[PDB]
Amino acid sequence: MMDAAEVEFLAEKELVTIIPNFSLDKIYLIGGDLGPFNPGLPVEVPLWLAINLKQRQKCRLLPPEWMDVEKLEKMRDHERKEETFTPMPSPYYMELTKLLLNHASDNIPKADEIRTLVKDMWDTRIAKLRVSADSFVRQQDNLTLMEINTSGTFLTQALNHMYKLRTN
Amino acid sequence: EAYFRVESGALGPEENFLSLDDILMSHEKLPVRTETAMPRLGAFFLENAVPQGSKLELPLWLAKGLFDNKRRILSVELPKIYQEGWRTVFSADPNVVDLHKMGPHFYGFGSQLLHFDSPENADISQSLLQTFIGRFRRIMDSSQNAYNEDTSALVARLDEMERGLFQTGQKGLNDFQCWEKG
Amino acid sequence: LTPAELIERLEQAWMNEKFAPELLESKPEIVECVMEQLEHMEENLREDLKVSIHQMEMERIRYVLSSYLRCRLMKIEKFFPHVLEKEKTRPEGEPSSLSPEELAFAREFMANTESYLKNVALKHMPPNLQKVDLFRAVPKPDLDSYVFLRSQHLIRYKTIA
Amino acid sequence: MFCEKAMELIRELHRAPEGQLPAFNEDGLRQVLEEMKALYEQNQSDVNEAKSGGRSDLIPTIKFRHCSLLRNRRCTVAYLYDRLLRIRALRWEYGSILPNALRFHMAAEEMEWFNNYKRSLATYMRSLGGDEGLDITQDMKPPKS
């Protein structure tokens, strides 16, 4: 299985948009290229580089299109709507929110508000993951890796005790 | 961490030779009757030998080490809790039973207890699930949440394999919270 | 193949070996290659900001390669008997789920453990009972255990295996 | 005769919180073996006394003692192995040199197994690439910077 750290490492491969305050030629990285850097000129780079440059004080992070208050605030409801699991914006929606709100709240339009709004969607998403578990066990997708691991291992065991006792 | 112990197996067919949990489980006495006399063995069982028919309490490992399909050495009886007596009260509501006071290794012992070819083996197993799949909730809901004296009182009733589920769920809930922070 | 692809693969053989309850097939290629690609960089590397950016991409390239092998070693040790032999008992025509370095290691592992058991206590035992068949003492990977496969879902590994 | 002594040995390990390593129980192990020796002779005898001495009513008494020998063994092996599983971790935790605190809880045989263990892991890694392969003990957690 994977732990938060390990999963986050994957969220950090995710592309985000930043406007740098410097000029750098095109760096040819092993895992792709990173377009030339020009101040005041938008460039898409990996969340890890972004966060690095951000704290290195040499750039400004642009909030993902979806990280808009009323935008998600309209998704939480669509989640608390459909009885089942609602497909998420970013397949690491939880990570990006944690990494961006801890490292670049400066660039996020009103954090305190958006922050909570996000978890209210992880809570009523976990909740729905627990009630839906009681079932698969008893009667014997669309989730983010960060959800199927923070609960994975447990559900994993339970099932390893089912088929083991359901046969004994 | 880097310390990966030998996990249990008592719920599957046999135990796991190197499992500390399994040796610990299999060390619980059991209601056993004698068939043929056993000389010398009278000093340990303070009552030069042990008559035929004596009612004894022997480790599940010993009772199983002597038992065979002829009962030519040992007679065993299903402990009071695995009996259809409670096997009904559990059917009512398992989430109220005190699976710890009763055999601490409720599930594990119950499974290994099948070897003794009891006729009513089936009915037992068809209850070892009804009582687990029945408590699966109150156990998960307790683990996937911060501590309170509702878990400190619930936990005091889970058996050894549940107290285990409890920890695991209590681990991820504490791995993610140790991440959601700074 | 291409650096971009290569790495991408490593993250597969890495995660695969991390969700599969058994010492998966050895991918001595993805491994020796990324090993080569990295060293390649450490060279051209030794400007400022540029270099730094390359070192960071490497600490991740390294991280996975390690987290990867580190997972394999954990598996072999957790099953040193059902591996040190499992190879010898694998039809020549299939992939050796253990490499020649992991071999001299899984091999050394037992020769150290076995000697320990014997010397420390297993030899002071009543004759005709001083030996132990680790091949049955140490449990084997439980193939019938539930996992998570990616359209993603979960179900016993054996069936999928 | 009930392998009770052996039990207090696997317990000294069940009562060890995370996977801490309590001091090796030299004394306990000795009392466990000497107990097997006793269980042996006094069982082999009854075995001889049965092959010749005629008295067959002994089989039960013999099998019983056999269980003891086995049990006492299962436990004394599981114990020595779980300590190895723990000692092993000590490598991926404190590094190459051992906190002189742990050496103090290990048997001379265990420190021996450990140094032989490190000594090989060392070789393994050093063969993963040119100029001393790749140390996989470092980079334990994904980088945060």
XYZ file of N, CA, C and O in Angstrom, chain B residues 1-6 15-24 26-29 36-41 44-45 48 57-59 61-62 64-66 68 72-73 160 182, chain D residues 1-4 7 10-11 13-14 18-19 46 49 55 57-58 60-61 63-65 67-68 70-71 73-75 77-79 81-82 85-86 88-90 92-93 140 144:
336
model
N 6.970 -0.504 10.199
C 8.293 0.068 9.814
C 9.143 -0.932 9.035
O 8.739 -1.428 7.980
N 10.337 -1.196 9.558
C 11.267 -2.142 8.961
C 11.093 -3.453 9.722
O 11.679 -4.481 9.369
N 10.280 -3.405 10.776
C 10.008 -4.587 11.581
C 8.691 -5.237 11.175
O 7.630 -4.850 11.658
N 8.760 -6.215 10.278
C 7.560 -6.916 9.842
C 7.481 -8.288 10.497
O 8.137 -9.236 10.061
N 6.670 -8.378 11.550
C 6.469 -9.607 12.313
C 5.774 -10.700 11.500
O 5.423 -10.497 10.341
N 5.575 -11.864 12.113
C 4.886 -12.953 11.428
C 3.410 -12.849 11.779
O 2.997 -13.080 12.916
N -2.388 -22.907 11.992
C -1.801 -21.706 12.583
C -0.528 -21.436 11.801
O -0.266 -22.077 10.789
N 0.260 -20.480 12.270
C 1.529 -20.173 11.633
C 2.581 -20.500 12.664
O 2.649 -19.893 13.727
N 3.390 -21.489 12.351
C 4.447 -21.927 13.240
C 5.174 -20.796 13.986
O 5.350 -20.861 15.202
N 5.583 -19.761 13.252
C 6.336 -18.651 13.835
C 5.540 -17.441 14.352
O 6.125 -16.468 14.836
N 4.220 -17.508 14.252
C 3.352 -16.439 14.709
C 3.246 -16.349 16.220
O 2.699 -17.242 16.842
N 3.745 -15.267 16.814
C 3.648 -15.111 18.266
C 2.174 -15.096 18.649
O 1.760 -15.689 19.639
N 1.376 -14.410 17.845
C -0.049 -14.324 18.111
C -0.686 -15.693 18.170
O -1.462 -15.976 19.079
N -0.352 -16.540 17.203
C -0.909 -17.886 17.145
C -0.509 -18.799 18.304
O -1.331 -19.574 18.791
N 0.740 -18.726 18.752
C 1.153 -19.580 19.853
C 0.402 -19.113 21.091
O -0.053 -19.914 21.896
N 0.249 -17.802 21.208
C -0.438 -17.176 22.331
C -1.906 -17.583 22.372
O -2.474 -17.808 23.439
N -3.349 -20.366 20.859
C -3.400 -21.797 21.104
C -3.003 -22.223 22.515
O -2.946 -23.424 22.799
N -2.729 -21.270 23.402
C -2.338 -21.639 24.756
C -3.485 -21.602 25.767
O -3.274 -21.775 26.970
N -4.702 -21.397 25.271
C -5.884 -21.338 26.127
C -6.416 -22.745 26.426
O -6.686 -23.519 25.507
N -6.577 -23.058 27.711
C -7.057 -24.369 28.137
C -8.334 -24.728 27.403
O -8.936 -23.886 26.748
N -7.898 -43.235 27.959
C -7.018 -44.276 28.472
C -6.222 -43.621 29.589
O -5.949 -42.424 29.541
N -5.866 -44.395 30.606
C -5.103 -43.851 31.716
C -3.747 -43.393 31.201
O -3.270 -43.888 30.180
N -3.138 -42.440 31.899
C -1.827 -41.929 31.514
C -0.898 -41.944 32.721
O -0.944 -41.049 33.566
N -0.046 -42.971 32.824
C 0.887 -43.072 33.950
C 1.855 -41.896 34.053
O 1.940 -41.070 33.147
N 2.572 -41.833 35.172
C 3.558 -40.789 35.436
C 2.935 -39.394 35.536
O 3.272 -38.619 36.430
N 2.029 -39.086 34.611
C 1.353 -37.788 34.545
C 0.337 -37.537 35.651
O -0.856 -37.400 35.382
N 1.815 -33.183 37.799
C 1.491 -31.879 37.235
C 0.026 -31.569 37.500
O -0.330 -30.440 37.839
N -0.816 -32.582 37.346
C -2.244 -32.432 37.586
C -2.548 -32.838 39.029
O -3.136 -33.894 39.274
N 0.997 -40.345 40.325
C 1.679 -41.380 39.559
C 0.969 -41.693 38.241
O 1.487 -42.452 37.419
N -8.603 -29.540 31.749
C -8.479 -28.233 31.106
C -7.101 -28.197 30.460
O -6.110 -27.916 31.136
N -7.032 -28.478 29.161
C -5.744 -28.493 28.472
C -5.567 -27.485 27.345
O -6.504 -27.184 26.602
N -4.343 -26.953 27.206
C -4.028 -25.983 26.160
C -4.564 -26.509 24.836
O -4.519 -27.713 24.583
N -3.293 -26.425 22.131
C -2.226 -27.087 21.396
C -2.051 -28.527 21.859
O -1.856 -29.429 21.047
N -2.132 -28.741 23.167
C -1.990 -30.075 23.733
C -3.184 -30.942 23.362
O -3.026 -32.041 22.847
N -5.085 -30.701 20.995
C -5.039 -30.993 19.567
C -3.886 -31.942 19.247
O -3.927 -32.668 18.263
N -2.860 -31.933 20.086
C -1.732 -32.817 19.862
C -2.042 -34.254 20.261
O -1.346 -35.183 19.854
N -3.089 -34.440 21.060
C -3.486 -35.766 21.520
C -4.729 -36.295 20.819
O -4.891 -37.495 20.644
N -7.518 -37.373 18.062
C -7.519 -38.099 16.792
C -8.955 -38.530 16.480
O -9.866 -38.260 17.269
N -9.416 -42.186 21.172
C -8.749 -43.211 21.957
C -7.772 -42.630 22.971
O -7.020 -43.366 23.604
N -7.790 -41.312 23.137
C -6.881 -40.653 24.073
C -7.490 -39.402 24.704
O -7.139 -39.031 25.825
N -9.168 -10.196 20.461
C -7.818 -9.968 19.977
C -7.631 -9.693 18.493
O -6.657 -9.048 18.118
N 1.218 20.288 9.510
C 2.402 20.862 8.898
C 3.578 19.904 8.861
O 4.005 19.534 7.744
N 6.719 -28.801 32.088
C 5.945 -29.893 31.427
C 4.683 -29.347 30.754
O 3.842 -30.104 30.269
N 4.550 -28.026 30.738
C 3.405 -27.382 30.100
C 3.922 -26.249 29.223
O 3.159 -25.400 28.758
N 5.233 -26.257 29.011
C 5.887 -25.262 28.180
C 5.530 -23.874 28.680
O 5.516 -22.912 27.917
N 5.236 -23.777 29.968
C 4.869 -22.501 30.558
C 6.075 -21.557 30.551
O 5.933 -20.361 30.310
N 6.562 -19.846 27.332
C 5.549 -18.806 27.172
C 5.984 -17.452 27.711
O 5.790 -16.425 27.079
N 7.812 -15.699 24.931
C 7.188 -15.032 23.806
C 6.391 -13.827 24.330
O 6.030 -12.925 23.574
N 6.140 -13.815 25.636
C 5.403 -12.732 26.267
C 6.343 -11.571 26.469
O 5.966 -10.422 26.276
N 8.094 -10.613 24.669
C 8.077 -9.989 23.354
C 6.723 -9.404 22.976
O 6.672 -8.453 22.211
N 5.631 -9.972 23.491
C 4.287 -9.461 23.197
C 4.061 -8.191 24.008
O 3.256 -7.339 23.647
N 6.121 -1.107 20.413
C 6.174 -1.009 18.963
C 6.785 -2.249 18.341
O 6.121 -2.992 17.616
N 8.050 -2.470 18.659
C 8.799 -3.597 18.145
C 10.133 -3.411 18.822
O 11.192 -3.738 18.288
N 10.608 -44.367 28.893
C 9.292 -44.979 28.756
C 9.163 -45.644 27.398
O 8.390 -46.581 27.232
N 11.367 -48.768 27.894
C 10.621 -49.557 28.868
C 9.346 -50.138 28.264
O 8.694 -50.986 28.870
N 5.026 -53.360 29.278
C 4.042 -52.343 29.664
C 3.717 -51.396 28.495
O 4.494 -50.483 28.194
N 0.652 -49.634 28.233
C -0.242 -48.570 28.678
C 0.432 -47.197 28.636
O -0.159 -46.204 29.065
N 1.660 -47.143 28.124
C 2.424 -45.899 28.076
C 2.253 -44.970 26.870
O 2.450 -43.764 27.012
N 0.051 -43.178 25.525
C -0.509 -41.870 25.878
C 0.534 -40.961 26.512
O 0.819 -39.874 26.008
N 1.104 -41.422 27.617
C 2.114 -40.658 28.330
C 3.268 -40.218 27.436
O 3.870 -39.168 27.661
N 3.139 -39.770 23.846
C 2.661 -38.763 22.897
C 2.561 -37.420 23.605
O 3.069 -36.407 23.120
N 1.908 -37.423 24.759
C 1.757 -36.216 25.546
C 3.106 -35.514 25.609
O 3.236 -34.397 25.127
N 4.112 -36.167 26.186
C 5.437 -35.551 26.292
C 5.986 -35.083 24.951
O 6.756 -34.123 24.891
N 4.288 -33.741 22.491
C 3.692 -32.437 22.254
C 4.535 -31.390 22.967
O 4.869 -30.362 22.386
N 4.883 -31.652 24.222
C 5.697 -30.716 24.976
C 6.995 -30.383 24.259
O 7.326 -29.209 24.089
N 7.763 -30.559 21.109
C 7.431 -29.747 19.942
C 7.054 -28.318 20.347
O 7.657 -27.355 19.874
N 6.064 -28.180 21.226
C 5.637 -26.864 21.692
C 6.876 -26.100 22.145
O 7.252 -25.109 21.540
N 9.615 -26.181 21.456
C 10.464 -25.849 20.318
C 9.851 -24.730 19.472
O 10.515 -23.741 19.164
N 8.587 -24.897 19.097
C 7.879 -23.897 18.310
C 8.120 -22.525 18.941
O 8.495 -21.562 18.270
N 7.917 -22.456 20.250
C 8.087 -21.224 20.995
C 9.515 -20.728 21.035
O 9.782 -19.544 20.814
N 11.703 -21.143 18.949
C 12.158 -20.759 17.610
C 11.515 -19.434 17.223
O 12.201 -18.503 16.766
N 10.196 -19.358 17.416
C 9.425 -18.153 17.114
C 10.022 -16.944 17.855
O 10.127 -15.843 17.309
N 10.408 -17.169 19.103
C 11.016 -16.144 19.929
C 12.314 -15.643 19.289
O 12.464 -14.449 19.008
N 13.319 -15.815 16.393
C 13.109 -15.270 15.056
C 12.542 -13.857 15.109
O 12.963 -12.975 14.351
N 11.581 -13.647 16.005
C 10.971 -12.340 16.141
C 12.002 -11.321 16.581
O 11.894 -10.155 16.242
N 13.765 -10.365 13.489
C 12.936 -9.487 12.670
C 13.048 -8.066 13.186
O 13.045 -7.105 12.413
N 13.146 -7.938 14.503
C 13.282 -6.636 15.128
C 14.695 -6.113 14.944
O 14.887 -4.975 14.527
N 16.740 -6.759 12.688
C 16.894 -6.398 11.285
C 16.495 -4.932 11.068
O 17.245 -4.153 10.464
N 15.319 -4.563 11.575
C 14.819 -3.201 11.443
C 15.850 -2.191 11.946
O 16.067 -1.153 11.329
N 16.490 -2.506 13.063
C 17.492 -1.626 13.645
C 18.500 -1.114 12.633
O 19.142 -0.091 12.858
N 17.761 -0.397 9.275
C 17.086 0.633 8.506
C 16.608 1.789 9.372
O 15.903 2.684 8.903
N 16.998 1.777 10.641
C 16.589 2.833 11.542
C 17.732 3.679 12.047
O 17.809 4.858 11.731
N 14.786 7.562 2.671
C 13.737 6.729 3.238
C 12.343 7.324 3.036
O 11.371 6.589 2.859
N 10.837 16.570 0.536
C 9.858 17.627 0.792
C 10.439 18.961 0.330
O 9.836 20.026 0.512
